[PDB]
Every structure is written in C-alpha cells, then in structure tokens.
Design an enzyme around this catalytic site. Structure first.
Site, PDB file in Angstrom:
ATOM      1  N   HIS A 100       3.992  10.904   6.171  1.00  0.00           N
ATOM      2  CA  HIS A 100       3.806  10.743   7.679  1.00  0.00           C
ATOM      3  C   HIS A 100       4.554  10.550   8.208  1.00  0.00           C
ATOM      4  CE1 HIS A 100      -1.322  10.357   6.156  1.00  0.00           C
ATOM      5  NE2 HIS A 100      -0.553  11.987   6.178  1.00  0.00           N
TER       6      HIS A 100
ATOM      7  N   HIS B 150       6.341   7.021   6.080  1.00  0.00           N
ATOM      8  CA  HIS B 150       5.595   6.692   4.838  1.00  0.00           C
ATOM      9  C   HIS B 150       5.377   7.980   3.858  1.00  0.00           C
ATOM     10  CE1 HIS B 150       2.109   6.300   7.110  1.00  0.00           C
ATOM     11  NE2 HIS B 150       1.796   6.848   6.157  1.00  0.00           N
TER      12      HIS B 150
ATOM     13  N   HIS C 212       0.919  -1.249  -0.318  1.00  0.00           N
ATOM     14  CA  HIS C 212      -0.024  -0.032   0.146  1.00  0.00           C
ATOM     15  C   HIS C 212       0.636   1.209  -0.346  1.00  0.00           C
ATOM     16  CE1 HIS C 212      -0.357  -1.592   4.317  1.00  0.00           C
ATOM     17  NE2 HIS C 212      -0.405  -0.816   4.241  1.00  0.00           N
TER      18      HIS C 212
ATOM     19  N   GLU D 109      -4.076  12.845   1.667  1.00  0.00           N
ATOM     20  CA  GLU D 109      -4.684  13.090   2.495  1.00  0.00           C
ATOM     21  C   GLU D 109      -5.246  14.374   3.152  1.00  0.00           C
ATOM     22  OE1 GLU D 109      -3.289   9.612   4.527  1.00  0.00           O
ATOM     23  OE2 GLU D 109      -4.552   8.228   2.748  1.00  0.00           O
TER      24      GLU D 109
ATOM     25  N   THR E 220      -5.236   6.685   8.968  1.00  0.00           N
ATOM     26  CA  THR E 220      -5.499   7.022   7.595  1.00  0.00           C
ATOM     27  C   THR E 220      -5.637   5.495   6.650  1.00  0.00           C
ATOM     28  OG1 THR E 220      -4.114   7.537   6.590  1.00  0.00           O
ATOM     29  CG2 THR E 220      -5.392   9.217   7.640  1.00  0.00           C
TER      30      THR E 220
ATOM     31  N   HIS F  44       1.885   9.327   0.995  1.00  0.00           N
ATOM     32  CA  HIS F  44       0.468   8.999  -0.324  1.00  0.00           C
ATOM     33  C   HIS F  44       1.367   9.496  -0.932  1.00  0.00           C
ATOM     34  CE1 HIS F  44      -0.873   6.919   3.955  1.00  0.00           C
ATOM     35  NE2 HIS F  44      -0.752   7.910   4.023  1.00  0.00           N
TER      36      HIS F  44
HETATM   37 ZN    ZN Z   1       0.021   7.670   6.208  1.00  0.00          ZN
END
Ligand code: ZN
EC number: 4.2.1.1
Length: 256
Positions: A115, A90, A60, A102, A194, A92
C-alpha cells in the site's frame, strides 16, 4: 487493536463502529462484474523526486516514510481529481504464501499486498485529508512468491534493525519506482483505511499485475515482531484485514 483472536478484525467495530460502515476496505474484486470505464484519464505515478526518510516498526506493519512537505512523489490522473502526495508505504502479509493480501481477486489471496499511501494536497496535511471522503489515494500492489524483486532488497536488508515495535532506522534514498510492476492497469473503487481508525477517505487504485518477490524476501518479513523489545516474541504475520461487504459500490476497471 491488533490481529489476534481477542483484538483482531472481528473485534475492531467495538472501538471503531465505522468498521461496519458503507464503504469499508478491503473488498473482493470480482473481475467479471467490474466494468471498464472509458471516462478514466491516464494514471500518472511520478516518483522521480521521491525522498524517503525513515523506516518504522509500528507494531502492526512497518512504514517507509517520505518527505511530503513539497510535491516530490505524487499520484495523479486515473480516477483522481488533483494531486496526491506520497507519505508512506507499508505491506500486509501472511504466515503462508497462500494468504496475506487484503484485497482479493475473484477470491484469490496473494502472499502480500503493498500500500502506497498518498494524500490530497487540497487539504494541506495528512491529518486533515483523512477527514475527507476524497482525502487519500492508496495504490495497492499484489505480491506473489516467485523471482526476487531487486528493488525490494534494500527494505529486506534493513528489517533486522527494526525487529520490534517502536524501532526505527534511517532509510534515505530509497526509490519506490523499484516496487512497481510493468503495467499500470488497475481497478478503482471508493473505500477506507484497512486499519483502525478505518476512516472512509480512500480512493483505492489496485493494480492488476502483481510483482514477484522471492521466498527469502517474504520469509524476512515474517521474522519481524508485533511485540516490543524485551517482550515475548509474537511473529508479525497475518497482519491483513479480510474482505468486507461491497454494499452500494461499483468497481471500475481501467482496461478492457
Ligand atoms: Zn495497508
């Protein structure tokens, strides 16, 4: 769970009913209703002794993991009581530069979001901390496409070795200070992880100042794969959850 049509964010509530809970993340940060809070103490990001170990494609995102067996890279101050240890970071990101973050700021989506995940040392380990309402503190940093971020290039260059789900690589001596913007001005609110299990254990601290990364750096993120080796290729892009209802929460600002 994943980010596709049949297993993405709109489906997560069936396996993880807290997806529809009272303190879910991310959220839109409405800058004209967030309130300056003078009770916020100064934020302390102390990363000088940070000890990175490994980078992992988990199907992911990719996580850069840190040794959290001693106080070596910690977040304190701001809205936080006590000491939170860095365990991983990590990102997104999107398929296009106009989406990927996000959190949103007055509905603006950034190209990506970093994050940095920390756990409250009062709870002894990360797995116990996620069961507590004040277990985690996640520092969120927006990425926009512009000039390259030199402190990110070591991450970009290792991605070729972790293209597919389950792959990992040694990743020692990475300094996460190279990912921070100049200003530590932030917004803060109580929320959640999240990704599933979506646990409501996070004090979110979202920096107002984005970092810039180059188009070449973000294009390399978009070459990663959600699939494992030997499976049909599915580019790892658009691994972001959209904004969730604020419900009975206030977002506080550290700055006037
Ligand atoms: Zn995250």
């Amino acid at each position: 769970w994943g980010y596709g049509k049949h297993n993405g964010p709109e489906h997560w509530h069936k396996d993880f009913p807290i997806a529809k809970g009272e303190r879910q993340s991310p959220v839109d940060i409405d800058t004209h209703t967030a309130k300056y809070d003078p009770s916020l103490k100064p934020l302390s990001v102390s990363y000088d002794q940070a000890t990175s170990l490994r980078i992992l494609n988990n199907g992911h995102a990719f996580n850069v993991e840190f040794d959290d067996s001693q106080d070596k890279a910690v977040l304190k101050g701001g809205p936080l009581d006590g000491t939170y240890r860095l365990i991983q970071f990590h990102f997104h990101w999107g398929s296009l530069d106009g989406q990927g973050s996000e959190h949103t700021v007055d509905k603006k989506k950034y190209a990506a979001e970093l994050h940095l995940v920390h756990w409250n040392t009062k709870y002894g380990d990360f797995g116990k901390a996620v069961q507590q309402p004040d277990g985690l503190a996640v520092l969120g940093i927006f990425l926009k496409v512009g000039s390259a971020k030199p402190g990110l290039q070591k991450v970009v260059d290792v991605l070729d070795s972790i293209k597919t789900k389950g792959k990992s690589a040694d990743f020692t001596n990475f300094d996460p200070r190279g990912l921070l913007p100049e200003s530590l001005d932030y917004w803060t609110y109580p929320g959640s992880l999240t990704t599933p299990p979506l646990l409501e254990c996070v004090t979110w601290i979202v920096l107002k100042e984005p970092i810039s990364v180059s188009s070449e750096q973000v294009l390399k993120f978009r070459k990663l794969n959600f699939n494992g080796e030997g499976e049909p290729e599915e580019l790892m892009v658009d691994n972001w959850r959209p904004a969730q209802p604020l419900k009975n929460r206030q977002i506080k600002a550290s700055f006037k």
